PDB file of C-alpha atoms in Angstrom:
ATOM      1  CA  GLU A   1      26.768 157.007  81.986  1.00 14.09           C
ATOM      2  CA  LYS A   2      30.703 155.268  82.478  1.00 13.34           C
ATOM      3  CA  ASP A   3      30.910 154.301  86.222  1.00 12.06           C
ATOM      4  CA  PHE A   4      33.949 156.150  88.319  1.00  7.27           C
ATOM      5  CA  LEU A   5      36.264 154.537  90.523  1.00  9.71           C
ATOM      6  CA  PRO A   6      36.054 154.530  94.721  1.00 10.16           C
ATOM      7  CA  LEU A   7      38.204 157.330  96.459  1.00  8.96           C
ATOM      8  CA  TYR A   8      40.767 154.915  96.953  1.00  9.53           C
ATOM      9  CA  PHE A   9      41.725 151.117  96.835  1.00 12.52           C
ATOM     10  CA  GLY A  10      43.366 149.146 100.021  1.00 12.01           C
ATOM     11  CA  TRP A  11      43.097 147.039 102.475  1.00  9.35           C
ATOM     12  CA  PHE A  12      40.705 146.902 105.591  1.00  8.23           C
ATOM     13  CA  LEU A  13      41.510 145.593 108.439  1.00  8.38           C
ATOM     14  CA  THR A  14      38.901 143.763 110.529  1.00  6.32           C
ATOM     15  CA  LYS A  15      37.727 145.510 113.275  1.00  6.09           C
ATOM     16  CA  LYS A  16      39.696 143.136 115.546  1.00  7.83           C
ATOM     17  CA  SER A  17      43.052 143.623 113.680  1.00  6.03           C
ATOM     18  CA  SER A  18      42.358 147.808 113.676  1.00  6.01           C
ATOM     19  CA  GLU A  19      41.545 147.350 117.237  1.00  5.44           C
ATOM     20  CA  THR A  20      44.445 145.559 118.409  1.00  5.58           C
ATOM     21  CA  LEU A  21      46.838 147.436 116.378  1.00  7.14           C
ATOM     22  CA  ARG A  22      44.435 151.135 117.260  1.00  6.03           C
ATOM     23  CA  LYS A  23      45.586 150.143 121.151  1.00  3.06           C
ATOM     24  CA  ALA A  24      49.998 149.355 120.352  1.00  6.91           C
ATOM     25  CA  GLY A  25      49.910 152.363 118.481  1.00  7.67           C
ATOM     26  CA  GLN A  26      48.229 154.680 121.402  1.00  4.98           C
ATOM     27  CA  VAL A  27      50.413 152.143 123.955  1.00  9.06           C
ATOM     28  CA  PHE A  28      53.930 153.368 121.879  1.00  9.29           C
ATOM     29  CA  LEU A  29      53.062 157.171 121.748  1.00  5.90           C
ATOM     30  CA  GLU A  30      52.368 156.912 126.247  1.00  7.12           C
ATOM     31  CA  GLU A  31      55.858 155.079 125.787  1.00  5.46           C
ATOM     32  CA  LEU A  32      57.150 157.686 123.684  1.00  3.14           C
ATOM     33  CA  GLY A  33      56.452 160.916 125.500  1.00  3.09           C
ATOM     34  CA  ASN A  34      57.426 159.416 128.583  1.00  2.40           C
ATOM     35  CA  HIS A  35      60.760 158.101 127.821  1.00  5.34           C
ATOM     36  CA  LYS A  36      63.800 160.250 128.477  1.00  7.93           C
ATOM     37  CA  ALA A  37      65.290 160.136 124.916  1.00  8.11           C
ATOM     38  CA  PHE A  38      61.810 161.912 123.367  1.00  6.17           C
ATOM     39  CA  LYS A  39      61.883 164.214 126.472  1.00  6.01           C
ATOM     40  CA  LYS A  40      65.697 165.372 126.022  1.00  4.84           C
ATOM     41  CA  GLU A  41      64.285 166.457 121.968  1.00  3.40           C
ATOM     42  CA  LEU A  42      60.636 168.145 122.729  1.00  3.26           C
ATOM     43  CA  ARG A  43      62.892 171.051 121.171  1.00  2.00           C
ATOM     44  CA  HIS A  44      62.533 169.370 117.298  1.00  2.00           C
ATOM     45  CA  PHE A  45      59.491 168.439 118.038  1.00  3.38           C
ATOM     46  CA  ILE A  46      57.796 171.674 118.757  1.00  3.33           C
ATOM     47  CA  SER A  47      58.746 174.881 118.815  1.00  5.18           C
ATOM     48  CA  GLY A  48      56.813 176.095 121.547  1.00  6.47           C
ATOM     49  CA  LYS A  49      59.781 171.998 132.957  1.00  6.51           C
ATOM     50  CA  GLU A  50      56.549 170.344 132.023  1.00 10.57           C
ATOM     51  CA  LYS A  51      55.419 166.780 129.933  1.00 12.46           C
ATOM     52  CA  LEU A  52      53.256 166.824 126.115  1.00 13.44           C
ATOM     53  CA  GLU A  53      51.161 164.481 125.420  1.00 10.43           C
ATOM     54  CA  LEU A  54      51.198 162.769 122.206  1.00  7.02           C
ATOM     55  CA  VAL A  55      47.902 160.897 121.999  1.00  2.91           C
ATOM     56  CA  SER A  56      46.566 164.098 122.500  1.00  6.34           C
ATOM     57  CA  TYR A  57      48.937 165.656 120.073  1.00  4.04           C
ATOM     58  CA  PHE A  58      47.600 163.574 117.381  1.00  5.44           C
ATOM     59  CA  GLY A  59      43.524 164.386 117.597  1.00  5.44           C
ATOM     60  CA  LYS A  60      42.835 163.539 114.378  1.00  6.46           C
ATOM     61  CA  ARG A  61      42.793 159.411 114.083  1.00  6.85           C
ATOM     62  CA  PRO A  62      40.549 157.143 112.326  1.00  5.04           C
ATOM     63  CA  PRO A  63      37.239 156.649 113.762  1.00  3.40           C
ATOM     64  CA  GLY A  64      36.896 152.945 113.613  1.00  2.00           C
ATOM     65  CA  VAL A  65      38.287 150.556 110.996  1.00  4.39           C
ATOM     66  CA  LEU A  66      41.590 151.178 109.804  1.00  5.80           C
ATOM     67  CA  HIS A  67      43.873 150.348 106.553  1.00  8.54           C
ATOM     68  CA  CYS A  68      46.666 150.465 104.028  1.00  8.52           C
ATOM     69  CA  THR A  69      45.974 152.460 101.160  1.00  7.37           C
ATOM     70  CA  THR A  70      47.221 151.329  97.649  1.00  8.86           C
ATOM     71  CA  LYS A  71      46.196 153.467  94.957  1.00  7.98           C
ATOM     72  CA  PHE A  72      44.446 157.155  95.312  1.00  6.94           C
ATOM     73  CA  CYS A  73      41.895 157.403  92.361  1.00  5.32           C
ATOM     74  CA  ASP A  74      39.853 160.309  93.535  1.00  5.52           C
ATOM     75  CA  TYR A  75      36.965 158.422  91.596  1.00  4.20           C
ATOM     76  CA  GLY A  76      39.241 157.954  88.748  1.00  2.00           C
ATOM     77  CA  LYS A  77      40.025 161.703  88.616  1.00  2.00           C
ATOM     78  CA  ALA A  78      43.930 161.480  90.150  1.00  2.00           C
ATOM     79  CA  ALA A  79      45.879 160.300  86.977  1.00  2.09           C
ATOM     80  CA  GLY A  80      46.393 156.514  86.473  1.00  3.29           C
ATOM     81  CA  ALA A  81      43.256 155.964  88.771  1.00  6.28           C
ATOM     82  CA  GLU A  82      41.834 153.891  85.321  1.00  7.46           C
ATOM     83  CA  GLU A  83      45.012 151.953  84.493  1.00 10.73           C
ATOM     84  CA  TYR A  84      45.092 150.836  88.055  1.00 10.69           C
ATOM     85  CA  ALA A  85      41.032 149.736  88.349  1.00 11.47           C
ATOM     86  CA  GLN A  86      41.516 147.756  84.562  1.00 10.10           C
ATOM     87  CA  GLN A  87      44.273 145.403  86.227  1.00  8.13           C
ATOM     88  CA  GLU A  88      43.080 142.006  86.500  1.00  7.46           C
ATOM     89  CA  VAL A  89      44.781 142.085  89.617  1.00  6.74           C
ATOM     90  CA  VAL A  90      42.546 144.177  91.333  1.00  6.95           C
ATOM     91  CA  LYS A  91      39.756 143.236  89.864  1.00  8.51           C
ATOM     92  CA  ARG A  92      40.622 139.059  90.913  1.00  9.34           C
ATOM     93  CA  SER A  93      41.680 140.620  94.311  1.00  8.16           C
ATOM     94  CA  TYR A  94      38.507 142.410  95.654  1.00  4.35           C
ATOM     95  CA  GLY A  95      36.758 141.925  98.488  1.00  6.09           C
ATOM     96  CA  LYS A  96      39.500 138.716  99.104  1.00  5.86           C
ATOM     97  CA  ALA A  97      40.905 138.586 102.612  1.00  6.02           C
ATOM     98  CA  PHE A  98      44.859 139.311 103.192  1.00  5.60           C
ATOM     99  CA  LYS A  99      47.313 139.155 105.853  1.00  4.15           C
ATOM    100  CA  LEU A 100      49.412 142.654 106.345  1.00  2.36           C
ATOM    101  CA  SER A 101      52.761 142.486 107.614  1.00  3.19           C
ATOM    102  CA  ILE A 102      53.525 145.524 110.517  1.00  5.31           C
ATOM    103  CA  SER A 103      57.697 145.395 111.207  1.00  8.14           C
ATOM    104  CA  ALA A 104      57.426 148.930 112.815  1.00  7.77           C
ATOM    105  CA  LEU A 105      55.502 151.452 114.232  1.00  8.97           C
ATOM    106  CA  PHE A 106      56.675 155.781 114.111  1.00  9.19           C
ATOM    107  CA  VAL A 107      55.958 159.201 115.171  1.00  9.83           C
ATOM    108  CA  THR A 108      56.851 162.463 113.479  1.00 12.87           C
ATOM    109  CA  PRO A 109      55.806 166.021 114.429  1.00 13.27           C
ATOM    110  CA  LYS A 110      53.437 165.803 111.908  1.00 13.27           C
ATOM    111  CA  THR A 111      52.461 162.013 111.196  1.00 10.01           C
ATOM    112  CA  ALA A 112      52.272 158.831 113.697  1.00 11.09           C
ATOM    113  CA  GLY A 113      51.738 155.555 111.537  1.00 10.74           C
ATOM    114  CA  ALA A 114      53.026 151.750 111.293  1.00 10.22           C
ATOM    115  CA  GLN A 115      55.281 150.350 108.322  1.00  8.34           C
ATOM    116  CA  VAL A 116      53.944 147.582 106.208  1.00  6.71           C
ATOM    117  CA  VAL A 117      56.042 145.163 104.235  1.00  8.29           C
ATOM    118  CA  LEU A 118      54.002 143.973 101.474  1.00  8.18           C
ATOM    119  CA  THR A 119      54.099 140.326 100.259  1.00  8.85           C
ATOM    120  CA  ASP A 120      55.247 139.837  96.793  1.00 10.31           C
ATOM    121  CA  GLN A 121      51.195 138.880  95.664  1.00 12.92           C
ATOM    122  CA  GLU A 122      50.189 141.779  97.711  1.00 14.71           C
ATOM    123  CA  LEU A 123      52.593 144.024  95.636  1.00 13.83           C
ATOM    124  CA  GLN A 124      50.841 143.063  92.939  1.00 11.60           C
ATOM    125  CA  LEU A 125      47.701 145.098  94.132  1.00 10.91           C
ATOM    126  CA  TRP A 126      50.510 148.411  94.988  1.00 13.42           C
ATOM    127  CA  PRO A 127      50.105 151.068  91.861  1.00 13.27           C
ATOM    128  CA  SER A 128      53.458 150.970  89.482  1.00 14.10           C
ATOM    129  CA  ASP A 129      55.201 154.652  88.353  1.00 15.75           C
ATOM    130  CA  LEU A 130      53.762 156.833  85.743  1.00 16.61           C
ATOM    131  CA  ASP A 131      54.839 159.477  87.640  1.00 15.18           C
ATOM    132  CA  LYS A 132      57.701 158.343  90.647  1.00 13.85           C
ATOM    133  CA  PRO A 133      57.769 160.480  93.600  1.00 15.38           C
ATOM    134  CA  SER A 134      61.290 162.111  94.618  1.00 17.20           C
ATOM    135  CA  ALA A 135      60.271 160.902  98.023  1.00 18.26           C
ATOM    136  CA  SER A 136      60.396 157.209  97.279  1.00 17.75           C
ATOM    137  CA  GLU A 137      63.652 157.685  95.112  1.00 19.32           C
ATOM    138  CA  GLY A 138      65.582 154.722  95.275  1.00 17.85           C
ATOM    139  CA  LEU A 139      63.334 152.930  97.909  1.00 17.34           C
ATOM    140  CA  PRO A 140      61.760 149.379  96.926  1.00 18.38           C
ATOM    141  CA  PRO A 141      58.153 149.979  95.557  1.00 17.90           C
ATOM    142  CA  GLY A 142      55.937 149.563  98.477  1.00 13.93           C
ATOM    143  CA  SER A 143      57.875 151.308 101.129  1.00 14.75           C
ATOM    144  CA  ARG A 144      55.745 153.944 101.230  1.00 16.07           C
ATOM    145  CA  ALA A 145      52.986 150.983 102.291  1.00 16.60           C
ATOM    146  CA  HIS A 146      51.437 152.379 105.764  1.00 13.59           C
ATOM    147  CA  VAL A 147      48.676 152.397 108.925  1.00 12.92           C
ATOM    148  CA  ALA A 148      47.535 156.149 109.468  1.00 14.58           C
ATOM    149  CA  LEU A 149      47.403 155.826 112.974  1.00 18.44           C
ATOM    150  CA  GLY A 150      47.310 159.582 113.567  1.00 19.05           C
ATOM    151  CA  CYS A 151      47.654 163.510 112.476  1.00 20.25           C
ATOM    152  CA  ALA A 152      48.748 167.124 114.083  1.00 22.04           C
ATOM    153  CA  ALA A 153      45.572 169.488 113.131  1.00 21.63           C
ATOM    154  CA  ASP A 154      47.196 171.670 110.108  1.00 19.54           C
ATOM    155  CA  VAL A 155      49.109 167.976 108.560  1.00 18.81           C
ATOM    156  CA  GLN A 156      47.360 166.721 105.585  1.00 17.54           C
ATOM    157  CA  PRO A 157      46.794 162.788 104.765  1.00 18.13           C
ATOM    158  CA  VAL A 158      49.812 162.792 102.222  1.00 17.72           C
ATOM    159  CA  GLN A 159      51.748 163.311 104.833  1.00 17.12           C
ATOM    160  CA  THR A 160      51.841 159.701 106.335  1.00 18.10           C
ATOM    161  CA  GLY A 161      53.096 157.876 103.745  1.00 19.11           C
ATOM    162  CA  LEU A 162      55.984 161.009 102.842  1.00 19.43           C
ATOM    163  CA  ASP A 163      56.983 160.826 106.462  1.00 18.59           C
ATOM    164  CA  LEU A 164      57.792 157.082 106.155  1.00 16.27           C
ATOM    165  CA  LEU A 165      59.457 156.874 103.394  1.00 16.63           C
ATOM    166  CA  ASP A 166      61.645 160.204 104.267  1.00 18.46           C
ATOM    167  CA  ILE A 167      62.582 158.076 107.478  1.00 16.00           C
ATOM    168  CA  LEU A 168      63.577 154.963 105.305  1.00 13.72           C
ATOM    169  CA  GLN A 169      65.619 156.859 103.463  1.00 15.02           C
ATOM    170  CA  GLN A 170      67.687 158.055 106.234  1.00 18.06           C
ATOM    171  CA  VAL A 171      67.688 154.342 107.811  1.00 17.76           C
ATOM    172  CA  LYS A 172      69.120 153.758 103.825  1.00 18.62           C
ATOM    173  CA  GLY A 173      71.867 155.991 103.715  1.00 18.07           C
ATOM    174  CA  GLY A 174      72.870 154.254 107.579  1.00 19.78           C
ATOM    175  CA  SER A 175      71.688 157.736 109.227  1.00 19.32           C
ATOM    176  CA  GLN A 176      69.590 155.091 111.762  1.00 19.50           C
ATOM    177  CA  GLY A 177      71.960 155.066 114.432  1.00 21.00           C
ATOM    178  CA  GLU A 178      71.844 153.409 117.308  1.00 18.10           C
ATOM    179  CA  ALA A 179      68.992 152.543 119.673  1.00 17.81           C
ATOM    180  CA  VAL A 180      68.371 154.614 122.402  1.00 16.03           C
ATOM    181  CA  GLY A 181      66.502 152.445 124.076  1.00 13.38           C
ATOM    182  CA  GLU A 182      64.414 149.760 124.711  1.00  9.31           C
ATOM    183  CA  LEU A 183      60.028 149.139 124.567  1.00  4.95           C
ATOM    184  CA  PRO A 184      59.110 145.939 125.047  1.00  2.24           C
ATOM    185  CA  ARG A 185      57.833 145.868 121.601  1.00  2.00           C
ATOM    186  CA  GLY A 186      61.437 147.072 119.904  1.00  2.00           C
ATOM    187  CA  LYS A 187      63.824 148.731 119.755  1.00  2.00           C
ATOM    188  CA  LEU A 188      63.536 152.860 119.667  1.00  2.00           C
ATOM    189  CA  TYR A 189      65.352 154.485 117.124  1.00  2.00           C
ATOM    190  CA  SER A 190      66.253 158.490 116.904  1.00  2.00           C
ATOM    191  CA  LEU A 191      66.772 159.763 113.244  1.00  2.00           C
ATOM    192  CA  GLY A 192      66.726 163.441 114.199  1.00  2.00           C
ATOM    193  CA  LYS A 193      64.485 166.308 113.541  1.00  2.00           C
ATOM    194  CA  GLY A 194      61.928 164.738 115.639  1.00  2.00           C
ATOM    195  CA  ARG A 195      61.859 161.549 113.961  1.00  2.00           C
ATOM    196  CA  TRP A 196      61.258 158.063 116.011  1.00  2.00           C
ATOM    197  CA  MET A 197      60.958 154.876 115.180  1.00  2.00           C
ATOM    198  CA  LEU A 198      60.233 151.133 116.901  1.00  2.00           C
ATOM    199  CA  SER A 199      61.694 148.444 115.423  1.00  2.00           C
ATOM    200  CA  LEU A 200      59.598 145.426 116.289  1.00  2.00           C
ATOM    201  CA  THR A 201      61.525 142.759 117.548  1.00  2.00           C
ATOM    202  CA  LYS A 202      57.976 140.831 116.356  1.00  2.00           C
ATOM    203  CA  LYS A 203      56.522 141.676 113.260  1.00  2.00           C
ATOM    204  CA  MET A 204      52.889 141.993 113.909  1.00  2.00           C
ATOM    205  CA  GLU A 205      50.384 140.602 112.121  1.00  2.00           C
ATOM    206  CA  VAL A 206      46.745 141.514 110.883  1.00  2.00           C
ATOM    207  CA  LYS A 207      44.051 140.562 109.249  1.00  2.00           C
ATOM    208  CA  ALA A 208      41.701 142.613 106.522  1.00  2.00           C
ATOM    209  CA  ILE A 209      40.149 143.009 103.417  1.00  2.00           C
ATOM    210  CA  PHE A 210      40.961 144.272  99.886  1.00  2.00           C
ATOM    211  CA  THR A 211      38.213 146.558  98.862  1.00  2.00           C
ATOM    212  CA  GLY A 212      37.026 150.171  97.514  1.00  2.00           C
ATOM    213  CA  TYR A 213      36.197 153.185  99.850  1.00  2.00           C
ATOM    214  CA  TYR A 214      34.258 155.864  98.396  1.00  2.00           C
ATOM    215  CA  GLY A 215      34.093 158.185 101.213  1.00  2.00           C
TER     216      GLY A 215
END
């Protein structure tokens, strides 16, 4: 009997760090939905005189504690899941505390989440390229690093990281555009196709422990 891996490795925010980011995320959706910049472009958001509530729009949310996923392993069935688990840094970091840096919150017609900017030490726990996806092409590793805050009814969990990457691909091209508004936390940007990003004036710091989830 070999030992199977967790469902996925990642940094799991503490109760207070979760609550803090969880509230700020909720606030952001309430601010965006009220913002006039967003109300003009509801057409790009949903196909169907009145107003949308984004907290309700993102019904599928994390029940309790939040987290930043590193490697999806699926108990080893996923490719590269085993090679990642043998890494001394993964073994050495298992159960240790880390401080993740949130640089921005984002919203799409599919997902709501937060951008994570990992340190080098934390990037060593980031899985590398055996198959390298199309979405993260040209972007440095860990660009996908995120914390899922909300998903639309028919959106899959993988979509959050892809939505973050997609938004970051536009910023690289310089299609970020000028800020269309100013929220108390930072500048609001409209990237088109229902994509919205809040660039935090102050990098929010969260406290988490690197471990594995089993379902």
